[PDB]
């Protein structure tokens, strides 16, 4: 009897919880075909006045009632997924929120008429002035949805939102939501203008400042490429830099707004790499809304994580607002992804197209409405039209809420413009340098010590005293002290980074009592620079774009990414070709981003040799990126320092050393430190006289030292070795100081480790030839073409480096 | 007490989902669900003695006891397996599992427990005898994915599963690659003395070998990869479409892929979703895979993506492992869908590890107490192995030396570029079958415009008209499935192509069906397939199919070339290098469109020059076809040499459509493909002052401007093939300008793209001694191309003049 029933009205409540969304009014077309626990008969009953406890569902209800609420609240336009989730308090939560609407009021609902009113009169206008659809028709209620999300999050204390989409939509939202002036687009089409190379319309960001009645929020659209779906990790990494320059720094405060379409988000595993990284510290923004314009489910990767996923219908501008809230809300709530599925499709399998012919747009679905309720005649909704349309025909700002930005907000002004070769502060005061020195080197007793470190540690109190030469991590780390002494905050992100994958930074220490970290550069004075280690682990795309978001968004911050090894960086290439060395001329974009990629012929085989310079090498024009091959612990300390203090932002690649961290000669002085500069070339550092030099070799990195230590022991004195430390921008002048000494000498060659078809070589022939003398000859010394960056086993690498340092020292 | 007869029920599902938050899982134990508390469900001690109906609880003792139930639902749902499958929305799946798991679960016999702890010694002693001879990447901790892998193999042997191919990583590599696949322990000990192409570190080899099971020969195919991990995942996939793909019987049991991934790596790299939302897609699904994650501390709720059933297990129990091994298995032959197993366990390479005893010793131990083997037995087996590591012997005793028909590549191993190959087709064969591709049974009703696209293709069947691109090139496909030889065409709507110049498939416009005349040739024919695609993972597919079948010309098409970066992995550790590092051989063909035609940064270029920098040693070709014929001869030479290298295609955007870029029956008939072309206007030798140099589209840029300023004094050659660099082509179409000191390579593409840089060489070699080279093209950029329409096009008619002007 009845005991048995209430049991089977409560299995009834939770069917329509899990299940309700998949027999939900969805699809504005209604050709969806729904696929059972959600007929009464199922769980036996038939009874719909006899009354029943509810439990948790937001006391005492006749049957047929809650079915009918039941109905409402999970079958309308409305469907929400949700009870995969485990939080007890989350679902509970939104139970409460959506289990309860109050009606919207004459002005809100008009508004919304307002928006989809400009939504469709944009696409219509651009229809007839430029025949040439990736119009946002009709998905129009994307903009009462950008709209109204903005206003909630000023009514919440957000300051900024920063947003990434694709090109569906794009113009729409560029002009209605971000406030782009109508004329400055249709020059565009007209093709009036950047002065640099630029990009196509749909590929456009903007920024702006939007006021709502809870105050003035930042809005901050993304550039992008076409390549689909990784300006996401670019927009978190915008993200976390703003955040990680407010005062306290809480994630409602900064919103990260990312638009998906449903192919690309199932179909690219950047999504899977940025979802997995968002959970990690020193990448968490405290969740992002992820808006999926849902045409031709897909939204089914957010439960590799367990998000929330509200499904709506886009010709319910309405329940469209209601969802926007409940999904900002909870994201503000429990700092969490959240995902809106908006099921729309494209105004513009042709048994649907005759579907979507027939059927009434947006604004026209929700005018009749207003109209049977009394709230806007047809008078009112045309008006609305004929406003817009001649707004349009004006040319200017048509979304009322947009303001100019301030002064303040111009953060990038004093970063551009500026000249690689520019002077900086390159000096540091010997006391001072001391004084750092020995701060960052000394632990306090409290901090057990594993026995290496602490050896490494004492070597760096031997340094910072003058009794003993810096090592790479002894210099490197010095570096970062005197960034952060003067205020320059660091932030190094990447595998193993703290410690090193080749043990050499240490910068973080591991207590082997309370099994805590201590990290000296965080040590040194109030009010410094923040210094900030992360370390990664794979999702390498994600992580690199995520660098480049940050580094993009902050110029005071020495940004480092550094990878494991530097032929694992392919795994970015679409970073490294689409933003980092192109984004300047396409978007007028600068960025400091510094890369570290260890990078060395030392016989570990094909993917732990090569960073393949030799492909940055080529990206390199008009100025876009530094390639640098540092040899020494004052270059490297030199070299960070410069990309620090002066003033231009442009990405520095670095080859980064492994074997050389140790190398007994690969050491600098304090003198070389305080007193000294980055070095674009460095000159022959042994006595030679320059009347017996019959050749000279230029060389960068390692390859160096093998060339000097198999001189040294030949006994030899009539051939010089010079580095090119710097290898684009090309440093002609400091290779004409190097090279002076030498302008008698008509056999120069260069040497590399890496083969022939790879290094710079091919790349930076052409700069060598400018810079040689006159009269003189240029030969190559170094391994062979070949397929693969490195051979396999480490005989066969010795006897090619043997055979190619001989080759280059060999005059006879 | 009829409503805890609803309760029971409840309770049973609880256990039925959740059950595997609470199963013994972790073997160390270094690891709360109130729905699996009878309480929860209102359920008292006292109910225990009171019996209940099980609903579908498969057991099927039909009425239990309560108390009774419960025991029997902890020792199936939270025992040394957890079973995640609720999830799945099937109900014959759900039932069909539960049919399996809540039934028993498993006796092994005497002959079988002993083959376990046999394997395990195997696992434990390899590890062991290599710790101490060379002081690898132990499995140690892990043991038990040896018997699993043996037990898979075993079953399915049994299941008519004639091949099984498999990727992994690091981890465990040396182990499987002895105790499973049957390398011999001395070559793998010689590996480590450096007794030994470029080659490669040994953790990434992969191996071939046969395995006799009492089901029958099984072929095991374990594949090589890079140090980049689960990139091979999908490489793997495509090998066994391949393999499925020369079955008469298609028959998806018959194939068998395995992924081993780390816990780490599965959720870090978005290949694996890549993979996932793939293996849904016709042709690059293959009947499911089986995936095992090794797990060393969740991982595996990518998942749930694609609805996957999953199966923990406790390592430190070899029965567990075998039964859940046989359980995935019979799933994925049953409903052909990807299963993941969850392999519990730890590295033995802290304080709670070391006093933990290894997984021979748990085993061994637990056949003493079962009297089923002893210490002297358990203790032998040990000894056993020890000494046949020390012969140096195969030591699998089911490998065997494989059959010379394996051997599927033995006919393409050592071919050179410019060998002969068959070139003409007879006249009358060609029109014939240039008239059946573009005659379409009537039945089927076509888009008015793909109407007049197929009429102007009889036109050219029939002479009247010259051949364009899509002519030409499906022409070409004609010709080989004609002759037997399968085509499969991969791509981003390479069915009717982004450029609507293809139309190999016609969507007939009544039935909502679909005709592909390369499908209606003659019976007997070579497979056309073309299939509309995650661009990581399909490259990678096709790397592996290509990889795997040598005798069918696999074409992969990027939407546009700017695209292909997206697979810039797949491209440099395995397409670019896998022959010098591993001997891997493979054909692929990679359409890359490509041309400077003002549409931007990601429209424009396929990064020529990435390519032609990757080129040494023979191991790619690449081209830029100028003409249909061209096209058409390329495609053929690919298919048609023993050589099997991968082909990369500068491939036209334009040119398309282009009014001189055409071709005669004549060339298609008679022709060949040419590495170079010559001066094709009537040209006095002794006028020309100046050769200019170039490839692809500009060339009809260059040649029109010729026109229209009726210049007779710059000759215009075009180099077709960049590499290998054709040296007696160009000897032969620079012969008669001997004479000239002036030349010009140009080129669209801007200073530091393009061939400049990395062919400049090439250039200097194979003109006259006296002569001058300089560059006409873009100036260098950061960006591949410009945003904009106007100022791209003062900068082709500048590069243009700029090359045609002399003096
Ligand atoms: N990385 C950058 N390079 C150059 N200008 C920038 C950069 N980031 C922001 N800006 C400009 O500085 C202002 C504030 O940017 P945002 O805070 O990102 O909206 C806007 O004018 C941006 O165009
Ligand atoms: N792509 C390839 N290049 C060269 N040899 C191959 C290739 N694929 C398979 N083989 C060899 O052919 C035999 C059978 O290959 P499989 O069927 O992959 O086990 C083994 O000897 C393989 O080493």
């Known amino acids: 009897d009845t005991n048995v029933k209430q049991v089977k009205?409560?299995?009834?409540?939770?069917?329509?919880?899990?299940?309700?969304?998949?027999?939900?009014?969805?699809?504005?077309?209604?050709?969806?075909?729904?696929?059972?626990?959600?007929?009464?008969?199922?769980?036996?009953?038939?009874?719909?006045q006899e009354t029943f406890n509810?439990?948790?569902?937001?006391?005492?209800?006749?049957?047929?009632?809650?079915?009918?609420?039941?109905?409402?609240?999970?079958?309308?336009?409305?469907?929400?997924?949700?009870?995969?989730?485990?939080s007890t308090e989350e679902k509970r939560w939104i139970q409460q929120r959506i289990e309860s609407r109050a009606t919207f009021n004459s002005e809100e609902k008009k508004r919304f008429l307002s928006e989809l009113t400009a939504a469709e009169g944009l696409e219509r206008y651009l229809g007839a002035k430029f025949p040439g659809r990736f119009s946002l028709e009709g998905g129009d209620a994307l903009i009462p949805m950008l709209k109204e999300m903005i206003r909630h999050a000023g009514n919440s204390g957000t300051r900024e939102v920063v947003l990434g989409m694709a090109h569906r939509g794009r113009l729409n939202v560029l002009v209605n939501v971000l406030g782009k002036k109508p004329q400055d687009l249709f020059d565009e089409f007209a093709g009036k203008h950047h002065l640099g190379t630029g990009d196509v319309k749909y590929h456009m960001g903007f920024s702006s400042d939007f006021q709502t009645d809870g105050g003035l929020v930042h809005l901050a659209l993304a550039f992008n490429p076409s390549h689909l779906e990784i300006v996401s990790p670019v927009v978190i990494?915008?993200?976390?830099?703003?955040?990680?320059?407010?005062?306290?720094?809480?994630?409602?405060?900064?919103?990260?707004?990312?638009?998906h379409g449903d192919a690309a988000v199932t179909g690219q595993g950047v999504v899977q790499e940025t979802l997995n990284m968002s959970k990690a510290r020193g990448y968490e923004?405290?969740?992002?809304?992820?808006?999926?314009?849902?045409?031709?489910?897909?939204?089914?990767?957010?439960?590799?994580?367990?998000?929330?996923?509200?499904?709506?219908?886009?010709?319910?501008?309405?329940?469209?607002?209601?969802?926007?809230?409940?999904?900002?809300?909870?994201?503000?709530?429990?700092?969490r992804d959240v995902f809106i599925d908006l099921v729309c499709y494209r105004r513009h399998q042709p048994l649907m197209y005759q579907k979507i012919k027939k059927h009434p747009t947006p604004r026209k679905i929700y005018a009749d409405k207003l109209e049977q309720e009394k709230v806007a005649t047809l008078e009112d909704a045309t008006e609305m039209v004929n406003l817009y349309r001649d707004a349009l025909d004006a040319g200017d700002c048509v979304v009322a809420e947009w303001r100019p930005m301030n002064m303040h907000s111009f953060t990038w002004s004093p970063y551009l413009n500026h000249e690689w070769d520019e002077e900086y502060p390159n000096k540091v005061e010997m006391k001072r340098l001391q004084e750092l020195a020995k701060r960052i080197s000394t632990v306090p007793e409290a901090v057990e010590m594993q026995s290496r470190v602490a050896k490494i540690y004492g070597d760096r109190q031997a340094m910072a005293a003058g009794e003993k030469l810096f090592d790479w991590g002894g210099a490197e780390n010095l570096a970062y002290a005197t960034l952060?002494?003067?205020?320059?905050?660091?932030?190094?992100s990447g595998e193993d980074s703290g410690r090193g994958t080749f043990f050499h930074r240490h910068a973080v220490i591991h207590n082997q009592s309370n099994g805590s970290t201590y990290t000296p550069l965080q040590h040194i004075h109030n009010g410094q620079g923040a210094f900030r280690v992360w370390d990664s682990v794979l999702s390498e795309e994600a992580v690199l774009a995520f660098e480049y978001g940050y580094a993009t968004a902050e110029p005071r911050t020495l940004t480092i990414?550094?990878?494991?090894?530097?032929?694992?960086?392919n795994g970015a290439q679409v970073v490294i070709d689409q933003?980092?060395?192109?984004?300047?001329?396409?978007?007028?974009?600068?960025?400091?981003?510094?890369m570290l990629l260890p990078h060395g012929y030392e016989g570990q085989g094909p993917e732990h040799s090569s960073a393949r310079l030799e492909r940055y090498l080529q990206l390199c024009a008009e100025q876009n990126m530094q390639v640098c091959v540092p040899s020494t612990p004052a270059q490297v300390y030199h070299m960070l320092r410069r990309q620090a203090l002066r003033g231009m932002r442009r990405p520095l690649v670095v080859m980064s050393p492994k074997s050389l961290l140790r190398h007994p000669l690969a050491v600098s002085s304090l003198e070389e430190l305080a007193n000294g500069t980055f070095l674009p070339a460095i000159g022959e550092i042994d006595e030679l006289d320059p009347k017996g030099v019959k050749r000279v070799v230029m060389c960068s990195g390692k390859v160096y030292?093998?060339?000097?230590?198999?001189?040294?022991?030949?006994?030899?004195?009539?051939?010089?070795?010079?580095?090119?430390?710097?290898?684009?921008?090309?440093?002609?002048?400091?290779?004409?100081e190097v090279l002076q000494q030498f302008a008698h000498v008509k056999d120069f060659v260069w040497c590399q480790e890496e083969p022939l078809n790879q290094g710079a070589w091919y790349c930076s022939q052409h700069h060598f030839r400018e810079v040689i003398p006159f009269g003189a000859s240029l030969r190559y010394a170094g391994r062979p073409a070949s397929a693969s960056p490195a051979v396999g086993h480490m005989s066969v690498h010795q006897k090619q480096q043997q055979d190619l340092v001989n080759d280059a020292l060999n005059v006879e």
């Open 579 to 594: 933003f980092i060395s192109s984004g300047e001329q396409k978007w007028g974009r600068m960025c400091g981003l510094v």
């Open 285 to 335: 923004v405290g969740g992002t809304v992820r808006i999926v314009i849902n045409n031709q489910y897909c939204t089914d990767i957010g439960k590799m994580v367990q998000a929330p996923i509200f499904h709506v219908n886009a010709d319910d501008p309405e329940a469209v607002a209601f969802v926007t809230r409940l999904a900002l809300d909870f994201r503000n709530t429990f700092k």
């Open 54 to 86: 509810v439990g948790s569902f937001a006391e005492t209800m006749k049957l047929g009632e809650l079915l009918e609420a039941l109905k409402q609240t999970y079958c309308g336009p409305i469907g929400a997924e949700y009870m995969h989730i485990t």
């Open 9 to 48: 009205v409560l299995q009834l409540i939770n069917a329509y919880r899990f299940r309700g969304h998949q027999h939900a009014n969805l699809d504005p077309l209604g050709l969806w075909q729904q696929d059972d626990l959600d007929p009464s008969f199922h769980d036996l009953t038939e009874d719909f």
């Open 561 to 569: 990414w550094e990878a494991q090894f530097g032929d694992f960086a």
């Open 705 to 736: 030292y093998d060339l000097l230590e198999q001189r040294r022991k030949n006994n030899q004195h009539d051939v010089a070795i010079v580095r090119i430390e710097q290898l684009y921008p090309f440093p002609h002048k400091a290779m004409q």
């Open 237 to 259: 990494g915008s993200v976390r830099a703003r955040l990680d320059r407010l005062d306290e720094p809480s994630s409602n405060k900064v919103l990260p707004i990312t638009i």
């Open 484 to 492: 952060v002494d003067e205020g320059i905050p660091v932030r190094l």
